[PDB]
Write a structure and sequence with these properties.
The PDB classes it as ligase. The structure is a homodimer. By secondary structure, the first copy, chain A, is of the alpha+beta class. Chain A has five helices and 14 strands. In chain A, helix 1 packs parallel to helix 5. The longest helix of chain A is centred in the middle third of the chain and has 23 residues. The two termini of chain A are about 15 Å apart. Bound molecules: guanosine-5'-monophosphate (5GP) (2 copies). One guanosine-5'-monophosphate (5GP) binds next to strand 8, strand 11 and strand 14 of chain B.
Chain lengths: ~230, ~230
């Protein structure tokens, strides 16, 4: 759904594709316009976060589905922040889908396809070569990002249910937000109806993906999607 | 605007009045229904906060403009939390009115009429007999309260611009949220128009106070004010 194209030692192109994949590629489909929507939503979110002084890999746009991003020494992590009980959290806590958490939960996953992205804790993270100090910074950033996105979206009648972030290290040694921020990598629910406006629509055939993703875009920008 | 009536060693009545005062009582007016609205908005806010496990002095209602509250050993503080630049903050930061702060600011004021509520820091607070540990707890509670109120109001198209909290100590030695939480003690702006829906309307004759306060009530409860 994304292709990384190197430019040089300090930057690269992140290209967003219309291809969608779930359940280890056993489920595949192409959604005309998905790439554009995810790229554009990523821009909006990265820029919103940067306004608050969050460091992100975003540099500029290089076309509708193409972002220029700074090259990083990437942490082998998926960092997940959860506000509302959904998906895999139902397997860890005796709480129903939709349950509003008293505080946001941060989970750490070892980014590794062969092991199917297993959950880790701070000890495992050290073995993987990530210091406790780094993990503390990463979680602090993640929670700050969580609050900005959650509040921004809440004003637009969208629940930030949960989402995945990735991080890397820049030349200075600063920790920098990377990958993407889109309905591919977040759970968004309509505040009134609780319907999914994200990749779960595709994962579980709950409706029309392109329609859900256009909805998010329209609510954020006020504009019907261009392309 | 409030009268404290002692009952006994552990509780008292906080009575909300229709009288309004600004600029050290040099500016005065009576707004029919103001007391009821502030009393009722206080109930709503205290209960909302208690649902999140914030300890407050609120015990019960004893009439439209009367609350039963627990007797506390009061800290001589006004604790102000600020999300958006307004009022006196324009005298401290080179930032325009309406500027959205990256993070909430907590200011401490020594509650003292003669000295006109001067700003203090942690060192002054110690001389006034408040330990650094207490101040830390107070500020932690204040920021938690800020987040709950801000998010709750934002969903209703109301910007929590800033607000004043007061705190006391109960029998157990726990730190308890006290005084009131109303358009008298908060800055609320309409999200779309940025107009004041609070005591600033009276302070600076920017419109109809009772109209602004009813607006807050209506938006929160969905009901036009009873009395
Ligand atoms: N696109 C994508 N999103 C993920 C991945 N892992 C977790 N997430 C996101 O993180 C959240 C939690 O996922 P869960 O662990 O409940 O399946 C969801 O918003 C989900 O979309 C992944 O490998 N790819
Ligand atoms: N009613 C009232 N509100 C106050 C007082 N002190 C601070 N506040 C509130 O706290 C915020 C900050 O006030 P400022 O420092 O800008 O005068 C405003 O919302 C203001 O109404 C006070 O003594 N009385």
């Amino acid at each position: 759904a994304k292709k990384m194209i190197p430019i040089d030692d300090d930057k690269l192109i992140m290209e967003f594709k219309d291809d969608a994949t779930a359940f280890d590629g056993t489920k595949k489909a192409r959604f005309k316009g998905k790439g554009w929507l995810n790229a554009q939503l990523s821009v909006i979110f990265f820029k919103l976060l940067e306004e608050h002084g969050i460091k992100t890999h975003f540099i500029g746009v290089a076309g509708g589905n193409r972002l220029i991003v700074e090259k990083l020494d990437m942490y082998p992590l998926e960092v997940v922040v959860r506000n509302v009980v959904a998906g895999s959290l139902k397997k860890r806590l005796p709480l129903p889908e939709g349950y509003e958490l008293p505080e946001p939960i941060v989970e750490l996953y070892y980014k590794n396809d062969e092991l199917h992205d297993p959950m880790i804790n701070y000890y495992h993270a050290k073995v993987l070569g990530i210091s406790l100090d780094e993990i503390k910074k990463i979680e602090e950033i993640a929670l700050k990002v969580n609050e900005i996105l959650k509040d921004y979206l809440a004003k637009k009648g969208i629940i930030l249910v949960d989402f995945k972030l990735e991080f890397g290290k820049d030349k200075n040694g600063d920790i920098v937000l990377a990958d993407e921020i889109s309905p591919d990598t977040c759970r968004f629910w309509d505040a009134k109806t609780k319907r999914s406006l994200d990749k779960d629509v595709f994962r579980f055939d709950k409706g029309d993906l392109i329609e859900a993703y256009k909805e998010i875009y329209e609510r954020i920008t006020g504009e019907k999607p261009e392309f």
